[PDB]
């Protein structure tokens, strides 16, 4: 059969993981006890020092900016939690792509098995395509040009949207690598900037896979549809069908083209 | 109150002393002429049966009951006009939520099987060539018959 | 103002209330 | 303790299919209460057939039967097969189903027999694995008839198995 | 009252030594077609 | 003959209506009595509140204030009729076209 | 025939697909209007309007 889609979408999780989010957690996990125990003892030793000596306002300015802090803290610690937010992303992007706008009912596939299922009925047809050019030796080549174009059009199709597929996944799993180094950026005032930034980042990449998953998943699935019942029969024109499927690919390209700019149009249009 | 007067007494069980089989002393007729229709085979009535059959089943059910009329092992080959099936249904006892065990004997002119039947209603259908047949709906979504090993 | 908000709350609650096939396969009968 | 709790035993008044002769209650309840190799064959039957095999849509007829059939051990070993990651609901769920058939059961001794079988997986592909061949080894007694109409409909002998093993064959 | 329990309440059964068989608005027009085409046909077999 | 654009946009169409159109539908539908009745005795409590507390205008200010935020939420809730405004848009294409 | 048939198609297609984009993209603003009808409460959520 035809499997694409999914083999690069493993391979894309598994070196977005294992660098990415697997660097994160370890180096989280190695600072959270020393990082625990140096607020603490840090903690305790300003408490003295306000207490006897410095400056302070004892009970309300003193324990709710220790508030602040600890709160902060363990809000960026709650990182450590990293494979359960790749989980997340990696399975939002099935569920939503599934059933939520084709109504129809999910054994529970996920994107590259739909994308791959869709390009080997294309790809079916061109190998049909083939197969009655090879049967007319000569005055058969007509057969190979309709299945080039039958292959063509599948392949750039499920081409652009698996690679915009394929950016989204990598540019969230690097922001979520790179975020704790921008969570603490919201600690000096100068810094807050990149934490303004990087979140718009995040809400571009997370509505352009919102957008490519869904819509994606239905075009797909209409091109899939439309290409299993072509045939090489007496009964259909070759015209019809060869130009429908053509229709079809640029059609769900230009709309796709479009998504890109409508997701960072939104990112920009929320203030941040 | 403990009393009642009243008492219950118990179904007694009969055993069959040929199959060992313990017998206690709307859906069941569908699920009767279901079986018998989709089980038995006559080159004269088989028309009737098979769609009967086909308007019974859920389009699953369909495909695997026409696949017994398909290849060189097909019904209409193997028993085909020289060979005929007769089935009746002995009992039928729903247990649950779309499900019952019908208990049923066939044999060859020229056996004992238990069908597990899976099941719902679509409604009355809106064709007079259906509606003259399965006005309830009646469909099988899931079937299995297995027959006794050996003797039965 | 109490007539008014409940005429209009009437309203919306009035538009509030306000808002299986067989197979196909190869034929039954074939020629004996 | 004059409540109507506890009714009579369930009594089965056997009844022979060649002289029609009629029997009555006995101490079959604290023995053996399944009797003749024709009977015992037809639940050692029912059991591994149902025990083994599985259907989404027909499942919980053979779950419960398979319990109504089993003694708590036993009971205990079939539910666990459901449980987990590698839960037979979660393996084959709603896309693969297992059928078997029994070939030839032969009782061997006092409460045991052996059964011999086959299995196979289909699932919604439409495909079909090779069959399998399996042979259990059933331990077994009964317990006469159970107090509840949802039991004495689906086991009114008591038939139970003590113990259960199936190996590949 | 209890000492004196009723009568053993009668019990008889019937065993039928041939079959083992142990004894102790839109509904008017789908029999009537049924029937018809059960009664006006004939088969020796059915 | 050639449809392939028919049933691809009648596809569409029902696609967008059981997922973009009937869920706004659904939840409109829903907290329109709710929010509706919330509304009515917020006003009451808070027109009393005001005249026995924090200073407000109640002849210009109250009633004015609430006639805005009647008419908005008048609207925004008028959108849960969704079906006229989808066949009207279903509508306008052929009709031009 | 090939030269036809992608003419034919590639002005088809686009033409028929930003007719898809402007179909989908009104349904979209007309079901999520309220969120934002409702905008106009309040003055710093006006620029949603």
Same mark, same amino acid.
């Given at each position: ?12 999780? $598994? ?9 994160? @957690? ?9 990082? @625990? ?18 400056? &302070?306002?004892?009970?309300? &300015? ?5 508030? *602040? ?5 363990? %809000? ?13 992303? %990696?399975?939002?992007?099935?569920? &939503?792509?599934? @059933? ?27 190998? &049909? ?8 030796? @000569? ?49 000096? $005032? ?18 352009? %896979? ?20 072509? *045939? ?17 690919? %640029? ?22 | ?152 | ?32 | 303790?004059? /409540? ?5 035993? !369930? ?23 399944? +009797? ?19 259907? +989404? ?20 070993? +079939?539910?666990?097969? /459901? ?33 011999? /079988? ?12 090779? !069959? ?26 008591? /038939? ?7 190996? !590949?064959?």
């Amino acid at each position: 059969a035809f499997e694409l889609f999914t083999p690069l979408f493993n391979k894309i999780d $598994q070196t977005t993981a294992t660098y990415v989010t697997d660097i994160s @957690s370890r180096a989280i996990a190695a600072i959270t006890p020393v990082v @625990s125990v140096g607020l603490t003892l840090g903690f305790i030793t300003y408490g003295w020092l306000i207490i006897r000596g410095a400056v &302070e306002m004892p009970v309300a &300015e003193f324990l709710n900016r220790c508030l *602040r802090i600890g709160i902060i803290v363990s %809000i960026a610690l709650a990182g450590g939690l990293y494979q359960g937010e790749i989980a997340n992303a %990696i399975t939002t992007v099935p569920d &939503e792509l599934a @059933s939520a706008l084709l109504g129809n009912p999910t054994q529970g596939a996920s994107a590259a098995a739909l994308v791959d299922q869709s390009a080997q009925q294309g790809f079916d047809r061109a190998s &049909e395509a083939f197969e009655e050019a090879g049967f007319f030796s @000569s005055d058969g080549l007509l057969y190979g040009l309709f299945g080039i174009i039958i292959l063509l059009a599948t392949g750039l199709l499920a081409a652009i949207g698996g690679a915009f597929l394929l950016l989204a996944k990598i540019a969230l799993a690097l922001l979520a690598g790179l975020g704790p180094l921008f969570i603490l950026a919201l600690i000096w $005032q100068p810094t807050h900037r990149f934490f303004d930034q990087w979140a718009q980042q995040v809400l571009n990449y997370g509505l352009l %896979i919102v957008l490519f998953a869904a819509v994606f998943g239905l075009l797909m699935q209409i091109f899939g549809s439309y290409m299993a019942d072509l *045939r090489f029969d007496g009964a259909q024109n070759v015209a019809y069908a060869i130009g429908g499927s053509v229709i079809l690919s %640029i059609v769900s390209i230009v709309l796709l083209m479009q998504l890109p700019s409508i997701a960072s149009g939104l990112a920009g249009g929320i203030g941040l | 109150v403990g009393f009642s007067q009243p008492a219950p007494a118990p179904l007694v069980l009969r055993v069959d002393n040929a199959t060992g089989a313990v017998d206690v002393v709307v859906d069941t007729y569908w699920l009767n002429q279901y079986v018998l229709n989709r089980e038995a085979y006559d080159y004269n009535t088989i028309q009737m049966n098979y769609d009967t059959t086909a308007l019974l089943s859920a389009p699953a059910v369909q495909q695997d009951y026409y696949k017994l009329f398909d290849g060189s092992n097909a019904r209409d080959r193997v028993l085909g006009n020289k060979a005929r099936i007769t089935v009746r249904v002995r009992s039928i006892q729903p247990n649950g939520r779309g499900q019952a065990t019908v208990r049923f004997t066939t044999q060859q002119h020229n056996q004992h099987q238990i069908a597990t039947i899976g099941y719902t209603y679509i409604g009355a259908p809106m064709r007079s060539s259906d509606r003259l047949l399965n006005p309830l709906g009646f469909q099988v979504t899931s079937y299995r018959a297995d027959p006794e090993i050996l003797n039965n | 103002l109490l007539c008014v908000i409940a005429v209009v709350l009437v309203t919306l609650s009035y538009k509030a209330y306000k808002v299986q096939v067989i197979p196909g396969y190869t034929p039954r009968p074939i020629r004996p | 303790v004059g /409540f109507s709790q506890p009714a009579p035993a !369930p009594l089965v008044l056997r009844v022979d299919n060649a002289t029609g002769a009629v029997d009555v209650v006995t101490t079959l309840r604290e023995h053996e209460s399944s +009797y003749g190799e024709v009977v015992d064959t037809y639940w050692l039957n029912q059991y591994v057939l149902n025990r083994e095999a599985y259907d +989404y849509n027909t499942i919980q007829m053979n779950y419960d039967t398979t319990a109504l059939l089993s003694a708590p051990a036993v009971q205990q070993d +079939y539910y666990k097969l /459901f449980d987990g990651s590698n839960a037979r609901d979660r393996v084959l769920g709603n896309k693969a189903r297992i059928t078997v058939r029994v070939r030839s059961i032969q009782p061997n001794g006092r409460g045991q027999a052996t059964v011999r /079988f086959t299995t196979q997986q289909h699932n919604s592909n439409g495909t079909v694995e090779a !069959p399998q061949h399996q042979i259990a080894t059933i331990g077994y007694t009964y317990i006469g008839a159970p107090m509840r109409s949802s039991d004495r409909l689906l086991n009114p002998l008591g /038939f139970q198995v003590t113990s259960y093993r199936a190996d !590949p064959e």
